[PDB]
Amino acid sequence: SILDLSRYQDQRIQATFTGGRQITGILKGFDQLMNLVLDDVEEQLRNPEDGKLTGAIRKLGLVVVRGTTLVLIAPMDG
Amino acid sequence: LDLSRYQDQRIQATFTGGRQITGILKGFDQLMNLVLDDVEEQLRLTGAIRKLGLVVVRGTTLVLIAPM
Amino acid sequence: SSPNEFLNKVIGKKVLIRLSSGVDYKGILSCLDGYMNLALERTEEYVNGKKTNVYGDAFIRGNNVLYVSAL
Amino acid sequence: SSPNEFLNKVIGKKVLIRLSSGVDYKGILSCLDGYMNLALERTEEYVNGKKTNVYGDAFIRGNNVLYVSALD
Amino acid sequence: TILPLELIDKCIGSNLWVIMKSEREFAGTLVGFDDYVNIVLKDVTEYDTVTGVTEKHSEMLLNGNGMCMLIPGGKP
Amino acid sequence: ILPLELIDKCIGSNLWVIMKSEREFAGTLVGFDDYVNIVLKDVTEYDTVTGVTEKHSEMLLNGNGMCMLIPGG
Numbered sequence: 188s189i190l191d192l193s194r195y196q197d198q199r200i201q202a203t204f205t206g207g208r209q210i211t212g213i214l215k216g217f218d219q220l221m222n223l224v225l226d227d228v229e230e231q232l233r234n235p236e237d238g239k240l241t242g243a244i245r246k247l248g249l250v251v252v253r254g255t256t257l258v259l260i261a262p263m264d265g
Numbered sequence: 266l267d268l269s270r271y272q273d274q275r276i277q278a279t280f281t282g283g284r285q286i287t288g289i290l291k292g293f294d295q296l297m298n299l300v301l302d303d304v305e306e307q308l309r310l311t312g313a314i315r316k317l318g319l320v321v322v323r324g325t326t327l328v329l330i331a332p333m
Numbered sequence: 334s335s336p337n338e339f340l341n342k343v344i345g346k347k348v349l350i351r352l353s354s355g356v357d358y359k360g361i362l363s364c365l366d367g368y369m370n371l372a373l374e375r376t377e378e379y380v381n382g383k384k385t386n387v388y389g390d391a392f393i394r395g396n397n398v399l400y401v402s403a404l
Numbered sequence: 405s406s407p408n409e410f411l412n413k414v415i416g417k418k419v420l421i422r423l424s425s426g427v428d429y430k431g432i433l434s435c436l437d438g439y440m441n442l443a444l445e446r447t448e449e450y451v452n453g454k455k456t457n458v459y460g461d462a463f464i465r466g467n468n469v470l471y472v473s474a475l476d
Numbered sequence: 477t478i479l480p481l482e483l484i485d486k487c488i489g490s491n492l493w494v495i496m497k498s499e500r501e502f503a504g505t506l507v508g509f510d511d512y513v514n515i516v517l518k519d520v521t522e523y524d525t526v527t528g529v530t531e532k533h534s535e536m537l538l539n540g541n542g543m544c545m546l547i548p549g550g551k552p
Numbered sequence: 553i554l555p556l557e558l559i560d561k562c563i564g565s566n567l568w569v570i571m572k573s574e575r576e577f578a579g580t581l582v583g584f585d586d587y588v589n590i591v592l593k594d595v596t597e598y599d600t601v602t603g604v605t606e607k608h609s610e611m612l613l614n615g616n617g618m619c620m621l622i623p624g625g
C-alpha cells in the first residue's frame with residue numbers, strides 16, 4: 188500500500204473523507220499514516236441537504252490531507 | 266488521570282454522537298477505556314432508559330466523565 | 334484470527350465495506366498492510382441500494398470504516 | 405509542545421471546549437495529562453446556546469473534542 | 477479493579493453485544509481483537525435502531541473507533 | 553515531500569484548516585505536536601452551514617477532526 192500509492196505519484200487522484208467531503212488533486216507525497224500532500228486540489232461541492240455532487244468545484248491549491256479522516260483514494264477513470 | 270477517586274462511585278458519561286449513560290466505575294486504563302457496572306443509557310433526551318449491566322466503555326468515543 | 338488474519342482470509346472475495354454514514358463499498362479485496370489500509374480492484378459505491386459511483390482501483394482506510402464483511 | 409504550552413497557559417482560567425457546531429462546554433481548567441485529558445471544575449454544557457447541564461467537577465477527552473480556546 | 481482489555485480478552489469464544497455511536501448494534505461471537513480493539517465477530521446479527529431493520533453476517537471485522545460499548549453476553 | 557514537514561514550514565504563517573464538519577478555521581500557526589494537534593492565534597472561524605463567523609484570540613485545534621490543512625490560506 189505504501190508501495191501501491193507511489194504508482195500514482197505526480198498523477199491526479201480522487202479522495203473521500205469521513206463526513207462526505209470529496210476532493211481531487213495531484214499526489215505530491217504521503218506517509219505511512221496516509222497523510223497526503225495534494226497539489227491543485229478541487230473540492231467537489233455537495234448539495235446542502237440532498238448530499239449529492241452539484242457539479243460545482245472549489246479551489247484549494249496546495250493541501251495537506253489528514254489520514255485520520257481519509258477513507259478512499261482512487262485514480263482517474265483510465 | 267486520577268480516575269481512581271471515583272472507583273465504585275456512580276458516574277455519568279457522554280459519547281461522541283449523543284449517547285449518555287450512567288454506571289459504577291469498576292476500572293479503567295490509560296487510554297480511557299472503562300469498565301462500568303449497573304449501566305443505564307438515557308435514550309434520545311426522552312425520559313426513556315435501558316439497562317445494560319456490566320459494560321466496557323471505549324475511550325475513542327468517550328467525551329465526558331462526571332460524578333453522579 | 335486477528336483482524337489481519339481475518340482480512341487475509343477474505344482476499345480475492347467480494348467484500349462489503351460499510352461506512353459510519355451508511356455508504357457502502359463492494360469489490361474484490363486485493364491487498365492489505367499492517368495498518369489495515371485495503372486495496373481493492375473494481376469498486377462500487379452505494380447510498381442504500383443506489384449505485385452512485387465505480388472506481389477501477391481503490392485504496393480504503395480500514396481504520397476509518399464501520400465494518401468489513403465478505404459477500 | 406505548543407499545545408501543552410497553550411493549555412498550561414490557561415489552567416485555572418475559564419475555557420471554551422467545542423464538541424460540535426451544536427455542543428460546547430465551559431468551565432475552569434483544573435488539570436491535564438499527556439493524552440490531552442482535561443479536568444474542569446464547575447463545568448457547564450450548552451446545546452444551541454442553551455445551558456442544558458452543570459456537572460461540577462468533570463473530565464473531558466480533549467482527543468475527542470473539536471477545540472479548546474481561552475474564553476474571551 | 478478491572479482492566480477493559482483483559483475483560484475483552486476473557487470474552488473470546490463468548491457472545492458480545494456491541495453498541496456504536498450511531499444508531500447501530502451488533503451481536504455475535506468474539507473471534508479475536510486488535511490492540512486497538514478492532515474486533516472479529518462470528519455469526520453476527522446487526523440491528524438498525526432507527527428503522528428497526530436487521531441483517532446477518534457469518535463473519536465480520538467491526539472497527540473499534542466508532543464503538544461506544546461492548547457488553548459481555550448478548551442482546552438484550 | 554513529507555506532509556508533516558510541509559506543516560512545519562508554516563509555523564508563523566497563516567493557516568486555513570478545514571474539518572470533516574461544516575466548520576472552518578483561519579489563523580496563524582503557533583505550533584503543533586506529534587499528533588498534529590494545532591495551536592492557532594488571531595483566529596477567525598467559519599460555520600459554513602449557517603454562514604456565521606466567529607473569533608478567537610488563541611485556540612487548540614484537535615487533529616483528529618481535521619480533513620485539510622492549507623498553508624498561507
Ligand SMILES: [Zn+2]
Pocket residue numbers: 226227
Ligand atoms: Zn500545479
Ligand SMILES: [Zn+2]
Pocket residue numbers: 302303318319
Ligand atoms: Zn452487574
Ligand SMILES: [Zn+2]
Pocket residue numbers: 188191363364372
Ligand atoms: Zn497491492
Ligand SMILES: [Zn+2]
Pocket residue numbers: 363364365
Ligand atoms: Zn497483494
Ligand SMILES: [Zn+2]
Pocket residue numbers: 374389390
Ligand atoms: Zn487494477
Ligand SMILES: [Zn+2]
Pocket residue numbers: 522531532533
Ligand atoms: Zn451489515
Ligand SMILES: [Zn+2]
Pocket residue numbers: 554557
Ligand atoms: Zn525529510
Ligand SMILES: [Zn+2]
Pocket residue numbers: 422597606607608
Ligand atoms: Zn469557536
